Amino acid sequence: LKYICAECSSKLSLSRTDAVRCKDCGHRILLKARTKRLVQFEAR
Amino acid sequence: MIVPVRCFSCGKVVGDKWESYLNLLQEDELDEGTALSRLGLKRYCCRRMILTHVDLIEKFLRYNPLEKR
Amino acid sequence: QARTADFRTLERESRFINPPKDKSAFPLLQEAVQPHIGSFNALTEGPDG
Amino acid sequence: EWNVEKFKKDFEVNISSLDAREANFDLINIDTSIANAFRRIMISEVPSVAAEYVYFFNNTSVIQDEVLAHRIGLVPLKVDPDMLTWVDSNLPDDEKFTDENTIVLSLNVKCTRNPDAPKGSTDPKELYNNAHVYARDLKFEPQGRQSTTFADCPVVPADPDILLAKLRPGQEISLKAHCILGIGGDHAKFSPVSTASYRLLPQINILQPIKGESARRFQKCFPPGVIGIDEGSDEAYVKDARKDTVSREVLRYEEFADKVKLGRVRNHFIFNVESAGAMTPEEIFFKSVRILKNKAEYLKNCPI
Amino acid sequence: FTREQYQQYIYGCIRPEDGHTTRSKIVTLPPTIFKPYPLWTGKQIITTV
Amino acid sequence: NKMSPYELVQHKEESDEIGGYFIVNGIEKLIRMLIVQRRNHPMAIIRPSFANRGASYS
Amino acid sequence: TGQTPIVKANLYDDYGMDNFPNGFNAVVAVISYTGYDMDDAMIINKSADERGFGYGTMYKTEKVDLALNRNRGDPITQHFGFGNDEWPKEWLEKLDEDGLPYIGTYVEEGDPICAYFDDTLNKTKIKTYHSSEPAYIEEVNLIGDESNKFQELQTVSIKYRIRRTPQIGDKFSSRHGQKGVCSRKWPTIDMPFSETGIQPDIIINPHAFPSRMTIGMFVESLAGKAGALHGIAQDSTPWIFNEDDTPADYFGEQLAKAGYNYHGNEPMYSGATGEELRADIYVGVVY
Amino acid sequence: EKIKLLTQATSEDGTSASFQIVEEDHTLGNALRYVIMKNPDVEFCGYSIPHPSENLLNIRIQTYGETTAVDALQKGLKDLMDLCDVVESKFTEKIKSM
Ligand SMILES: [Zn+2]
Ligand SMILES: [Zn+2]
């Protein structure tokens, strides 16, 4: 589950050559969610 | 946006005094000058932080794309 | 002290938590765009259609 | 003629108050050159421990990453700077952070909606779970041999209720923070002092007698514990020349253009050191006379 | 200006090692006043500047 | 149109969001106001450019 | 972090400009002290914007689109993701398995923005970040096309955030026309300090005032400071003062009831030499 | 490389000499200048930062003879060490009184 619907906020996954839409409602905008990864900052 | 830790002109820790300030204006009906004096904010650089903070993060947080609405 | 405004805290802060479910606060800001809003509305509704 | 015993005969200290956070004391018959040098080390050169490298793993909250890392830099940590040493910048990032020069903090908080909230509520502490992230949510993780020397005193923030961040359900923050030493001249977060500054002792020079009902208005032109009237004869005198900020309120009146002038005692200092929590201001001033002593001791040994 | 103040303003502006002086040694003037304690003048600052 | 500032936040817009403008290709365009002659009022006008309509023009 | 001003009109709270804070209150000392702020410039306390004074970001968004070079029902030759060829494994650090970058990652010049496999060349090309200034990736939008034929994505919107910490040469301004770039972030131990313990976080030259004749900034200094001591906001909508009741008489007596002086001056010391300065220094909090 | 005698401004006699200390400021420069101006053999003295953005500190010493400027600087560093020792003891004498 890597993507979030912009309308109903359902965490979905989008396979290859797949229709870019949410399954719970036909909304055509998807938000790429933030997956757990190391990001480094200097606290200044 | 959210309350500034460590006020800009001297360095007094100020960020732990926002929720104590709204408590001392709503339940205890004080004016803004008595409440800044009860929290220990004496210097007028320290006073204009909690006095003039807008707390705009409470308006940002109502746009949550990670939850149904 | 006569020439003092007020920091409207606990009114600014209360309005940030929940927006008004009735009409909007600050109606004078809505009147600044009424020559734009009211000019698009005149060409679809009003007298004579 | 000057000598270090002549200065020892004339210098004294009159301490006014102690506290866990704020000291107030006096330096008598010392130069403005030296009293500034103590004032400039307590702000800029006495070390303290603050979070410098923050390692984010997930941050889906509204406050972004470098701002929330900058706030973790600014929270004071109640930890003794004498317990751990300095880092070396020439070392790479694998060997630079050891257990003798780095204290590790962690912040793993998840927000979710509270089903036990009352109906028609507004208070987000009732309405949400873990909606407010404070400074005491930064958890100390002892690594290596520092789980014995810090077991007597765990690393806690000196002001635990600092509102770091705010969340809504779905959102989460997961980070690791490495807090090392540093002086206040590098960043402001390494200064262990709210403010450390002096004011010279005000000298209120009464030139003419202020008998009568002029003393009831000469008293009003100062803070109330400064000018008192004598009970025997009506005559204004100085009770406490420390309680006044130098307002020059008497200089606004044509009655007192000659009866008083406001001087300043030349070598009398009033330090007011307000600590940020980690060290006592007894110790911050004690470390400042040691830095300036070791600063001249360093140049005395260097080859010219 | 006293003797510590007067000689501080000269080396703060001349600085012989960067090549502003022409003597390889900063020369000064006798003070304006000799008693009770020696004082200089801001005329006498720019004289030796 | 008649949304409360509560319902304008639930529809992602902004709480006290004033309208007025056109969204065209993602860019918020708006047509400016122009100050122009009053309607339905014959005003007496002297212009030197009225003489350049030809000869004998005042 | 924006702030509401001590000194504001009564129309400020009527249009709801607290919803949009466009500045911040700053302890401004009108003093020739530094030498670095003479003609039109200004300086900041260095430890002020180590604490976030005047900090802001910049949000930049560009649309990477893979379908602006074709027409009319041909096979889509460019697909997001990684193909099966020998593409270099260097850019797993920036990009996900979808050929799209991760949220929050740090991108300088030359790093890839997206990976796409090309069918007419049988090669995974990458577009790259064509900007000399570093940025962080905040959000990635999957703009899906609307048609009866359901289509693989060709359009991606990516938003960058750029840390605009206030460097020198950045223009600040008052609410009176007193602009000017920053000359130096002057350190705290080198700034003047008052008897109350504070230090100013802005120094402005007194030689910016006589030719410009902005006495609204002088009286904002008395009004701003006397409101910071009492916890009150004094209104500043124009023509609430006559020539009889000067505001310098009004805000002076508010400063005189707190302990400060009627003229808004404070006895300050130097940071370098530490000596008592000659005259008391004109200070205050303006916005 | 901390202390450095600037040889383009020193003297053959050793009486006049310019020094240069790295990573110092007004904290040490003003404090050391006061102590060496208490030496009754020093003719001229002053400190000067060339540029504030560069952590560099020049100190000039000129004297009336019979002592080099290096021997003056070692005395002023010794007595600024001793001045910090008598203000540290008397602070401890009064912090234990309370
Ligand atoms: Zn959906
Ligand atoms: Zn402050």
Swiss-Prot record, chain D:
GO terms for biological process: nucleolar large rRNA transcription by RNA polymerase I; ribosome biogenesis; termination of RNA polymerase I transcription; termination of RNA polymerase III transcription; transcription by RNA polymerase I; transcription by RNA polymerase III; transcription elongation by RNA polymerase I; transcription initiation at RNA polymerase I promoter. Signal peptide: none annotated. GO terms for molecular function: DNA binding; DNA-directed RNA polymerase activity; protein dimerization activity. The keyword ATP-binding does not apply. One of its GO terms (cellular component) is nucleus. Component of the RNA polymerase I (Pol I) complex consisting of 14 subunits: RPA135, RPA190, RPC40, RPA14, RPB5, RPO26, RPA43, RPB8, RPA12, RPB10, RPC19, RPC10, RPA49 and RPA34. The complex is composed of a horseshoe-shaped core containing ten subunits (RPA135, RPA190, RPB5, RPO26, RPB8, RPB10, RPC10, RPA12, RPC19 and RPC40) where RPA135 and RPA190 form the DNA-binding cleft. Outside of the core, RPA14 and RPA43 form the stalk that mediates interactions with transcription initiation factors and newly synthesized RNA. Belongs to the archaeal Rpo3/eukaryotic RPB3 RNA polymerase subunit family. Its main location: nucleus. This is DNA-directed RNA polymerases I and III subunit RPAC1. Present with 13000 molecules/cell in log phase SD medium.
Swiss-Prot record, chain E:
It comes from the Eukaryota. It is found in: Nucleus, Nucleolus. Belongs to the RNA polymerase beta' chain family. Component of the RNA polymerase I (Pol I) complex consisting of 14 subunits: RPA135, RPA190, RPC40, RPA14, RPB5, RPO26, RPA43, RPB8, RPA12, RPB10, RPC19, RPC10, RPA49 and RPA34. The complex is composed of a horseshoe-shaped core containing ten subunits (RPA135, RPA190, RPB5, RPO26, RPB8, RPB10, RPC10, RPA12, RPC19 and RPC40) where RPA135 and RPA190 form the DNA-binding cleft. Outside of the core, RPA14 and RPA43 form the stalk that mediates interactions with transcription initiation factors and newly synthesized RNA. Present with 2840 molecules/cell in log phase SD medium. DNA-dependent RNA polymerases catalyze the transcription of DNA into RNA using the four ribonucleoside triphosphates as substrates. Component of RNA polymerase I (Pol I) which synthesizes ribosomal RNA precursors. Besides, RNA polymerase I has intrinsic RNA cleavage activity. RPA190 and RPA135 both contribute to the polymerase catalytic activity and together form the Pol I active center. In addition, subunit RPA12 contributes a catalytic zinc ribbon that is required for RNA cleavage by Pol I. This is DNA-directed RNA polymerase I subunit RPA190. The lineage of its organism: Eukaryota, Fungi, Dikarya, Ascomycota, Saccharomycotina.
Swiss-Prot record, chain F:
Three distinct zinc-containing RNA polymerases are found in eukaryotic nuclei: polymerase I for the ribosomal RNA precursor, polymerase II for the mRNA precursor, and polymerase III for 5S and tRNA genes. Present with 14100 molecules/cell in log phase SD medium. Component of the RNA polymerase I (Pol I) complex consisting of 14 subunits: RPA135, RPA190, RPC40, RPA14, RPB5, RPO26, RPA43, RPB8, RPA12, RPB10, RPC19, RPC10, RPA49 and RPA34. The complex is composed of a horseshoe-shaped core containing ten subunits (RPA135, RPA190, RPB5, RPO26, RPB8, RPB10, RPC10, RPA12, RPC19 and RPC40) where RPA135 and RPA190 form the DNA-binding cleft. Outside of the core, RPA14 and RPA43 form the stalk that mediates interactions with transcription initiation factors and newly synthesized RNA. It is found in: Nucleus, Nucleolus. Signal peptide: none annotated. It comes from the Eukaryota. This is DNA-directed RNA polymerase I subunit RPA135. It comes from Saccharomyces cerevisiae (strain ATCC 204508 / S288c). Belongs to the RNA polymerase beta chain family.
Curated annotation (Swiss-Prot), chain H:
Its main location: nucleus. One of its GO terms (biological process) is nucleolar large rRNA transcription by RNA polymerase I. Keywords: DNA-directed RNA polymerase, Isopeptide bond, Nucleus, Phosphoprotein, Ribosome biogenesis, Transcription, Ubl conjugation. One of its GO terms (cellular component) is RNA polymerase I complex. It is found in: Nucleus, Nucleolus. The keyword Transport does not apply. GO terms for molecular function: DNA binding; DNA-directed RNA polymerase activity; protein dimerization activity. Transmembrane segments: none annotated. There is a cross-link at K90 (Glycyl lysine isopeptide (Lys-Gly) (interchain with G-Cter in ubiquitin)). Component of the RNA polymerase I (Pol I) and RNA polymerase III (Pol III) complexes. Component of the RNA polymerase I (Pol I) complex consisting of 14 subunits: RPA135, RPA190, RPC40, RPA14, RPB5, RPO26, RPA43, RPB8, RPA12, RPB10, RPC19, RPC10, RPA49 and RPA34. The complex is composed of a horseshoe-shaped core containing ten subunits (RPA135, RPA190, RPB5, RPO26, RPB8, RPB10, RPC10, RPA12, RPC19 and RPC40) where RPA135 and RPA190 form the DNA-binding cleft. DNA-dependent RNA polymerases catalyze the transcription of DNA into RNA using the four ribonucleoside triphosphates as substrates. Common core component of RNA polymerases I and III which synthesize ribosomal RNA precursors and small RNAs, such as 5S rRNA and tRNAs, respectively. Present with 8680 molecules/cell in log phase SD medium. Belongs to the archaeal Rpo11/eukaryotic RPB11/RPC19 RNA polymerase subunit family. This is DNA-directed RNA polymerases I and III subunit RPAC2.
